[PDB]
């Protein structure tokens, strides 16, 4: 039914004129109209604008010729609002394209909307959107995950085939898990952070959501390479992933971290993961127990580093050059402090306070600096484990999608969603969340963490797994 078709199916139809870009957009538009009132994936739907842009789209051999793509609303799309789901940035019109948006546009893609998120990418459920919650299309009593909640959701219901999110500590992977969709965060440095509203500069990476591994591999390839506007982007050639996912490499090895056995898992998740691994074993993967003696420290480490860099990256929202400004103030101090208290949500404010403390002289050595050192120990665990093994696997999440309000009482309860996801960001490694079962009606994601620059392998295994297990056929709302 068109919106039900994959990018391979859509491309062949587009290339031979059987369908037009406009029809494609119209298809997903209607599906959006079907689902959006329940789901609430988008902050700013742009199907209308995409409709118009499609008329001028002619060169069919462009890699993403007529493909609609949703975009997290912390990635800048010029001429349209980029809110980061914040009061302090509602009505901010983006003056420039993020590099990834530039590269998508050049590839013939069509930006179909700006996707809901936790305010400033800060959270694990999307509940901290300053505007409204996005809801899990597999159970609207349940959260779609976070921070890329809307990007995952809209890819689940297929109001868009393919999606862009960002991942600082699991913000692509955990929503991918909860929404029953593929989500990859590539190696740190593989995708530019130019035009990505910075949360934690040393942890952020734009990534991709999809339902077929080839969809994800292609979008990732496009948005990809070195960027001169980004100091931290790597001068490394982008591998031809679209031609590489379909290949099969013999005698690959999977590590199961011994320290993760001690992690409290939901029985359904445990069961799902065990089966995932048995089934991979059957296909010829060697399964080995590995050690990561420091991983348990991942979460404390992350929740020092992230909030620190966040307090610094958010110092610029001040009512001077753009965005919200408080109405009442007697002096520039009040202008500042009132604009910020009023414009920032509660999670953001918590991490800002934490950040400025962790960076304060007298506490810096024991907090931020300390954390950056534990981070190297953590990274080193991985590097050493990668001597014996090719990928590292675990559940993406310790639990099935949880309920609204369930993790808002103590902010810490929200942090604990990230226990299996943050290590990848700390080490700067690529990681993918892959749908592995449905348990009690709810998606379960399996996670594979790869070596630096080895997105290929992560993608290959994801491609092999979807052949055995066709999760792309499960669609949520009718």
């Amino acid at each position: 039914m068109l919106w039900k078709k994959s990018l391979s199916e859509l491309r062949e139809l587009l290339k031979r004129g059987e369908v037009s870009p406009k029809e494609v957009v119209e298809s997903f538009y209607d599906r959006y109209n079907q689902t959006e009132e329940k789901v609430k994936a988008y902050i700013t739907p742009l199907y209308g604008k995409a409709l118009k842009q499609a008329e001028s789209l002619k060169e069919r051999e462009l890699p993403l010729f007529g493909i609609p793509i949703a975009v997290k609303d912390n990635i800048l799309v010029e001429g349209e609002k980029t809110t980061c789901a914040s009061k302090i940035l509602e009505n901010f019109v983006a003056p420039y394209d993020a590099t990834v948006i530039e590269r998508l546009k050049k590839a013939g893609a069509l930006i179909v909307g700006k996707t809901n998120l936790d305010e400033f990418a800060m959270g694990s459920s999307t509940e901290y959107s300053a505007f409204f919650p996005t809801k899990n299309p597999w159970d609207l009593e349940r959260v779609p995950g976070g921070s890329s909640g809307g990007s995952a959701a809209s890819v689940a219901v297929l109001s868009a085939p393919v999606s862009l999110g960002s991942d600082t500590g699991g913000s692509i992977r955990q929503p991918a898990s909860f929404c029953g969709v593929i989500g990859i965060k590539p190696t740190y440095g593989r995708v530019s952070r130019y035009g990505l509203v910075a949360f934690a500069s040393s942890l952020d990476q734009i990534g991709v959501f999809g339902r077929r591994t080839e969809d994800v591999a292609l979008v990732l390839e496009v948005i990809s390479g070195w960027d001169e506007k980004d100091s931290t982007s790597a001068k490394v050639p982008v591998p031809e992933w679209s031609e590489e996912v379909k290949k099969e490499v013999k005698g690959l090895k999977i590590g199961l971290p011994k320290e993760f056995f001690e992690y409290e898992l939901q029985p359904q998740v445990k069961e799902a993961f065990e089966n995932f691994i048995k089934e991979l074993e059957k296909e010829g993967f060697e399964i080995k127990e590995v050690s990561l003696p420091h991983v348990k420290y991942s979460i404390p480490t992350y929740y020092i580093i992230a909030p620190s860099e966040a307090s610094s990256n958010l110092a610029r929202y001040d009512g001077v050059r753009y965005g919200y400004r408080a109405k009442e103030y007697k002096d520039i101090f009040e202008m500042y402090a009132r604009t910020r208290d009023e414009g920032f949500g509660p999670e953001v404010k918590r991490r800002i306070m934490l950040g400025t403390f962790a960076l304060s002289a007298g506490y810096y050595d024991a907090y931020y600096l300390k954390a950056q050192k534990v981070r190297r120990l953590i990274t080193n665990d991985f590097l050493k484990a990668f001597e014996e093994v090719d990928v590292i696997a675990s559940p993406t999440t310790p639990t099935l999608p949880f309920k609204f309000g369930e993790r808002l009482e103590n902010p810490i309860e929200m942090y604990l969603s990230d226990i299996l996801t943050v290590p990848a960001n700390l080490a700067g490694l690529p990681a993918i969340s892959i749908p592995i079962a449905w348990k009690d009606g709810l998606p379960v994601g399996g996670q594979l963490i790869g070596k630096h620059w080895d997105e290929t392998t992560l993608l290959q295994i994801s491609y092999l797994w979807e052949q055995k297990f066709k999760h792309y056929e499960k669609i949520p709302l009718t």
């Binding site: 003056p95 404390p300 020092i304 001040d318 965005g323 101090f333 934490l354 950056q372 050192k373 534990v374």
Partner: protein, 91 residues
């Protein structure tokens, strides 16, 4: 941790905290700080802070790049005047 602490950190951060927030943040942060104190145990003398691998510091020739059109550059300004951003006076 004290009220005095919550205020001092807010001042640094430019958040005029509302009274409701000063009570809530006294607990949450006091907790969060206990939640993250897990690193003393670990020895990090002789461990280098994390940085990504680069060979050479990436730099950039001294060649002008087209600036942003002044129009787009101020369009989001809460208050503009004569090409300038405007703010309350500073003393």
């Amino acid at each position: 941790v004290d009220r005095e602490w919550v205020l001092k950190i807010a001042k640094l951060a430019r958040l005029e905290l509302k009274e409701e927030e000063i009570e809530v943040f006294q607990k949450q942060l006091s907790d969060i700080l206990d939640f993250i104190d897990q690193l003393k145990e670990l020895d990090t003398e002789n461990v280098e802070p994390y940085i990504q691998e680069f060979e050479e510091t990436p730099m950039r020739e001294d060649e002008p790049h087209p600036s942003l059109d002044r129009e787009k550059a101020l369009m989001n300004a809460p208050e503009r005047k004569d090409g300038f951003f405007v703010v309350p006076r500073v003393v």
